[PDB]
Amino acid sequence: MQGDPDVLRLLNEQLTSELTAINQYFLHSKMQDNWGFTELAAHTRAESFDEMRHAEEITDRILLLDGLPNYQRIGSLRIGQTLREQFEADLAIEYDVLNRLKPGIVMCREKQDTTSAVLLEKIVADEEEHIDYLETQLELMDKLGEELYSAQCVSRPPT
Amino acid sequence: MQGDPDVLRLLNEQLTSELTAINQYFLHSKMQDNWGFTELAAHTRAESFDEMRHAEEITDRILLLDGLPNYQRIGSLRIGQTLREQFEADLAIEYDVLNRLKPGIVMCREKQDTTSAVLLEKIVADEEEHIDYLETQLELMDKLGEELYSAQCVSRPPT
Amino acid sequence: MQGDPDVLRLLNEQLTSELTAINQYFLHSKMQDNWGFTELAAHTRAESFDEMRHAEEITDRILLLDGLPNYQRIGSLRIGQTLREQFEADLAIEYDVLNRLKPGIVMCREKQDTTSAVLLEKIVADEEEHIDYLETQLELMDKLGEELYSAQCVSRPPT
Amino acid sequence: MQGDPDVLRLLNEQLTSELTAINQYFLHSKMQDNWGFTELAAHTRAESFDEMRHAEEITDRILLLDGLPNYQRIGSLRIGQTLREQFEADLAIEYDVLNRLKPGIVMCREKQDTTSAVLLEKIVADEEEHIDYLETQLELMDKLGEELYSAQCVSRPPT
Amino acid sequence: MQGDPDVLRLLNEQLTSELTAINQYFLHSKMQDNWGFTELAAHTRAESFDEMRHAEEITDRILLLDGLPNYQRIGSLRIGQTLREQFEADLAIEYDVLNRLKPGIVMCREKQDTTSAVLLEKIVADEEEHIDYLETQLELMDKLGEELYSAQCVSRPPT
Amino acid sequence: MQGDPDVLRLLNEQLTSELTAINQYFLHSKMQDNWGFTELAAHTRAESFDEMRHAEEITDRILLLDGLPNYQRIGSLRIGQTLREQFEADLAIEYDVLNRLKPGIVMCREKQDTTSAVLLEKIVADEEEHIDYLETQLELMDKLGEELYSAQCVSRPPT
Amino acid sequence: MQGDPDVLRLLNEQLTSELTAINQYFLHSKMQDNWGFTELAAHTRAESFDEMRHAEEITDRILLLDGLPNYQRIGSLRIGQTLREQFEADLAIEYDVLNRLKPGIVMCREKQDTTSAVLLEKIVADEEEHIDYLETQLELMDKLGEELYSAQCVSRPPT
Ligand code: HEM
Ligand code: HEM
Ligand code: HEM
Ligand code: HEM
Ligand SMILES: [Fe+3]
Ligand SMILES: [Fe+3]
Ligand SMILES: [Fe+3]
Ligand SMILES: [Fe+3]
Ligand SMILES: [Fe+3]
Ligand SMILES: [Fe+3]
Ligand SMILES: [Fe+3]
Ligand SMILES: [Fe+3]
Ligand SMILES: [Fe+3]
Ligand SMILES: [Fe+3]
Ligand SMILES: [Fe+3]
Ligand SMILES: [Fe+3]
Ligand SMILES: [Fe+3]
Ligand SMILES: [Fe+3]
């Protein structure tokens, strides 16, 4: 069996939006960790692993279609240097992915690959939550005030 | 606190060698996973998770010093279509790590960042041990026969 | 067996940087306790005991080398009278120790005492963490604002 | 057996400093409860019961001496209408008791009643802790700022 | 709250006698630990941990009063090369504590800090009991013989 | 992957040593057991067994470094004929080991063989500890006396 | 009680192929584990220890006969460079041992050391068990083929 070249591209293009996100997210939590937002550190680490889940899932698909999953390339990481920054820098990829995955899902249905369509419908819903979350952190950051908010991300005492 | 910019240079350099290997190693496994080489893929898979472990390990040391860890660059991946070829390409990476890290270790103690020295030293031991293993696979392929050796990386029944 | 007189001095000099730190740290936590930063109190107590670990370890070494461990002298304690103060007053010793232990480690290797070198390499890494921590508390104190931060060190309700 | 009339008075006078404190403390916690400082509510309730312990203990003594414990009278309750107020209103009795119990303890030794002296030495130490605490809450209230501090006395969410 | 500056004088004075003994006692143990006198070193070791316990105990009382506890001074240590000599030197310290503390106890009640009196009283009881023990070692050395007595502080086989 | 032939020489040189201890010690222990010093025997036995530990771990590096583990060589055995004697025989070895190994360590280090160093850095520490032990016996042998000490190496009752 | 030097000559001499066995078998199993014949390796190794127990039962009785165990005389090792020799080698010592013991059991029963008789009988039974094994290994090697036998000696996957 072989997979359709325009899917293969859309997959291997999500594969990278994954590889890309894995690093930022990971590194972002490790930084959250070093500044001392350990509570929050842990959760950014959580989302990070979630993306390695997605990559491994996309990878699984490509090989089934008999394509060559691309681990070699990467996206351009926005790397926030404050909490706020980082959330933005993250929403950054998240939306992109959505922007990339909407028409690609229908592209799939046209191409008649129901399995890869559902792979991507799921990533969408997953990511939408990541988004609603990230952007909520913001909604809340202004309601509370960076400062105050930030102590909601440390242990007692910190680290 | 603030580390020595060359040492950091060396550390953020290893962190690349590392992500290279994670990606490379992972892909080979999922690759052997495909060909039905399931027992083996679990092993290869495990090696990747170590290289992940290493990566965060270097990442930690970086932030403690102060440096900005590079989760943005990736070395050039070598992927072998066959098992034997796959073995070569990973030796390929490790032997490089030994080269990078030997002189590197000596310099670290020299510049008096002993802790970052001990770190790399450990790495070396693992890295050697991964090599011993991989070269030993290459002989068992010879001694046993590429086919017969291959019959030993599938389960019962296969995949 | 006998130990080399320049090591013996470096050991017995770290022995005191230990005895010294044991008191400040201890007293510092007991004060953190009395003001009411009990969460934090507990952790300063933690680091304190860690140093009595180091002293007892240095002491173990000296006797092996057949030297006379010096419990009689002490260092000059910087005793902070606010949280912030204290962290500084602590980083105070921590760096010193590092400053004292870098060339002493190589001194050891020259002298060819691998065991006492490793004793001190470990203290270094330990202390570097204490440092990264202490100085992080600072990084965070300014990001959060003494006040806010400080309630991150009490129980609910306080004491 | 009969007890010495000047002790009896000192006992039955502490008996009331007890009955008095039981109400304020209790009522004070119940108010802390209704405003919503439940964490803190619970602890004021704690000290309250501690005083009913003391009353019952004083009472035990008087009957042994064959006196008539006086449950009929009461002291004048300072009833705080803010957290701060209350702490003051409490330290209010606490010091009094100390002020009353120092010379009374020696009065006892003169009178040669070692048992009732020790009853009161204990109350002293108990109360000194209550004091150091209360007054610490203050020390901390200014360091933190009423507001901030106060949320250190609620549950998540409040009540 | 604020204690009586002379009493505090007395307390911060005991806290010195204490750190002296901790350091002295600990070192003797690790000292008997070396000579192979292992069973005995555990005992001596334990005595040190009590003196630590005492120290924090005095430290606590200090802060409650208000005084600044002296973790900066240390008395003059006497270290015996032999077991018997080692015994003398620790009697040396305790008998001093009895001298310091007797008159001290009387003054405390006098000045009407009964609680700090009770404290020292306790200390005395322990301090006497440590003395009883140490003098009794000195006789068993006599009765039994310094060698034979020494055979009773090693395990089986020795260290 | 091959290892530096000088190192492999030093590695092999420790190997024949360790094999000499495995044999020296083991016999001693048994002799000790046949003497009635069963308590002592056990201990010595645990030292020969741990000797064997190093032998294997040295064999490990050797094989990995691709040289040839020497199991034909075997230094000269001096087999003690008094308890005291055996002690002195075995200190003999532990010093030759320390005498060959302290210099031999830096060679490894300089010749960029980090792991081989750490290997021996550890054998060293053990040797120092076993040396310490053995001289601590002999000091104890003199303080107690031969009859006295020996008796601590018998079970009660003997054998 | 003293021993018959005819036997004491035998016993001590059996100790020799004994100690020589230990060494040969041990190194082999390390070579085998090292080549990747880990399943095979485990068994070889077990024989190594199975041999140390023979050295011990020998070393016990030698001492029981007021004899004098020899731990200096290592017999001439044969060292296989492939599984086929290794078997052959091992099978060599095992046979030598058989031809030296056959008579021995007669010299013993004659000169009247029955106990040593039954010791050496037992050693023999084992020696045959390991010979019956070493030759089946040689057959299965012919019957199945070398590559093929070799593949039942790796785990799955190979080490
Ligand atoms: C780039 C491609 C990567 C892929 C496909 C990948 C995949 C995975 C998978 C499948 C897991 C197991 C899922 C789980 O345990 O929940 C995992 C865990 C983990 N990942 Fe990754 N990962 C990647 C990169 C990274 C990076 C860049 C880091 C760190 C910077 C990292 C660090 C870790 C660690 C430390 C674990 C758990 C360790 C363990 O349980 O053994 N990985 N990853
Ligand atoms: C100055 C040299 C000192 C040394 C070498 C030393 C050593 C030790 C050691 C080895 C331990 C056990 C480790 C553990 O339990 O985790 C310990 C525990 C402890 N230390 Fe110290 N210490 C010293 C001074 C002090 C001081 C100044 C204080 C208080 C002001 C103190 C208070 C304590 C207490 C209360 C414990 C635990 C009590 C127990 O478990 O019995 N020590 N110390
Ligand atoms: C005025 C003289 C009083 C005395 C001598 C007294 C004595 C005691 C004693 C001995 C206890 C048991 C100790 C324990 O459970 O820990 C207790 C518990 C308690 N007290 Fe009082 N008390 C007094 C007044 C009050 C007042 C004014 C209140 C409330 C406004 C109160 C409410 C309670 C409650 C609700 C309990 C626990 C309920 C239970 O476990 O049955 N008491 N008291
Ligand atoms: C040369 C005379 C030796 C004697 C008499 C001896 C004695 C023994 C015996 C009786 C056992 C356990 C037997 C069993 O469980 O079946 C043992 C365990 C062991 N043998 Fe030996 N042994 C000798 C030499 C060696 C050598 C040459 C090596 C490797 C080079 C070695 C490595 C070990 C190890 C590593 C263990 C237990 C694992 C550990 O504690 O690390 N031994 N020894
Ligand atoms: Fe994703
Ligand atoms: Fe996400
Ligand atoms: Fe690596
Ligand atoms: Fe690796
Ligand atoms: Fe330290
Ligand atoms: Fe520290
Ligand atoms: Fe009361
Ligand atoms: Fe109270
Ligand atoms: Fe004391
Ligand atoms: Fe004491
Ligand atoms: Fe050794
Ligand atoms: Fe040793
Ligand atoms: Fe055998
Ligand atoms: Fe045998």
mmCIF file of C-alpha atoms in Angstrom, chain F residues 19 23-24 26-27 30-31 33-34 45 52 56-57 59-60 63-64 68-77 79 81, chain G residues 19 22-24 26-27 30-31 34 45 49 52 56 59-60 63-64 68-78 81:
data_model
loop_
_atom_site.group_PDB
_atom_site.id
_atom_site.type_symbol
_atom_site.label_atom_id
_atom_site.label_comp_id
_atom_site.label_asym_id
_atom_site.label_seq_id
_atom_site.Cartn_x
_atom_site.Cartn_y
_atom_site.Cartn_z
ATOM 1 C CA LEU F 19 43.674 -11.649 41.285
ATOM 2 C CA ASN F 23 43.684 -15.453 46.371
ATOM 3 C CA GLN F 24 45.773 -14.066 49.236
ATOM 4 C CA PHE F 26 40.527 -15.780 50.502
ATOM 5 C CA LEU F 27 43.138 -18.172 51.927
ATOM 6 C CA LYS F 30 39.826 -19.667 55.538
ATOM 7 C CA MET F 31 42.931 -19.954 57.705
ATOM 8 C CA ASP F 33 38.195 -19.737 60.057
ATOM 9 C CA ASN F 34 40.187 -22.963 60.714
ATOM 10 C CA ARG F 45 36.031 -13.173 53.124
ATOM 11 C CA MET F 52 36.790 -10.383 42.631
ATOM 12 C CA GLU F 56 35.455 -8.480 36.769
ATOM 13 C CA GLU F 57 34.990 -4.730 36.346
ATOM 14 C CA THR F 59 38.033 -7.448 32.702
ATOM 15 C CA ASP F 60 35.027 -5.348 31.613
ATOM 16 C CA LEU F 63 37.258 -6.412 26.815
ATOM 17 C CA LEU F 64 35.459 -3.163 25.898
ATOM 18 C CA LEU F 68 43.279 -9.241 26.461
ATOM 19 C CA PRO F 69 42.311 -9.940 30.107
ATOM 20 C CA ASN F 70 45.285 -11.610 31.780
ATOM 21 C CA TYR F 71 44.233 -14.611 33.863
ATOM 22 C CA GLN F 72 47.550 -16.484 33.620
ATOM 23 C CA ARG F 73 49.598 -13.979 35.575
ATOM 24 C CA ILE F 74 49.396 -13.930 39.380
ATOM 25 C CA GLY F 75 51.829 -12.123 41.685
ATOM 26 C CA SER F 76 53.612 -13.776 44.614
ATOM 27 C CA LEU F 77 51.498 -14.786 47.624
ATOM 28 C CA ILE F 79 50.392 -16.037 53.341
ATOM 29 C CA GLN F 81 50.950 -17.219 59.811
ATOM 30 C CA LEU G 19 41.900 -22.760 40.380
ATOM 31 C CA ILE G 22 37.887 -21.030 37.733
ATOM 32 C CA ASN G 23 40.141 -18.711 35.750
ATOM 33 C CA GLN G 24 39.657 -20.292 32.341
ATOM 34 C CA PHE G 26 35.503 -17.235 34.060
ATOM 35 C CA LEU G 27 37.337 -15.424 31.279
ATOM 36 C CA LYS G 30 33.261 -12.799 29.879
ATOM 37 C CA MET G 31 34.449 -13.279 26.290
ATOM 38 C CA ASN G 34 31.246 -9.794 25.337
ATOM 39 C CA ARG G 45 29.822 -18.331 34.223
ATOM 40 C CA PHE G 49 31.435 -20.479 40.363
ATOM 41 C CA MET G 52 35.118 -22.110 43.111
ATOM 42 C CA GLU G 56 36.651 -24.474 48.586
ATOM 43 C CA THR G 59 40.722 -25.962 50.586
ATOM 44 C CA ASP G 60 38.590 -26.965 53.593
ATOM 45 C CA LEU G 63 43.267 -27.556 56.218
ATOM 46 C CA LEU G 64 41.309 -30.230 58.108
ATOM 47 C CA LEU G 68 48.677 -26.498 53.326
ATOM 48 C CA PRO G 69 46.557 -25.122 50.436
ATOM 49 C CA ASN G 70 48.544 -23.840 47.437
ATOM 50 C CA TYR G 71 47.170 -20.614 45.915
ATOM 51 C CA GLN G 72 50.308 -19.660 44.040
ATOM 52 C CA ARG G 73 50.480 -22.377 41.421
ATOM 53 C CA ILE G 74 48.255 -21.437 38.463
ATOM 54 C CA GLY G 75 48.068 -24.189 35.844
ATOM 55 C CA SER G 76 48.445 -23.533 32.124
ATOM 56 C CA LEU G 77 45.370 -21.809 30.641
ATOM 57 C CA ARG G 78 43.935 -22.562 27.243
ATOM 58 C CA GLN G 81 39.096 -17.353 20.447
#
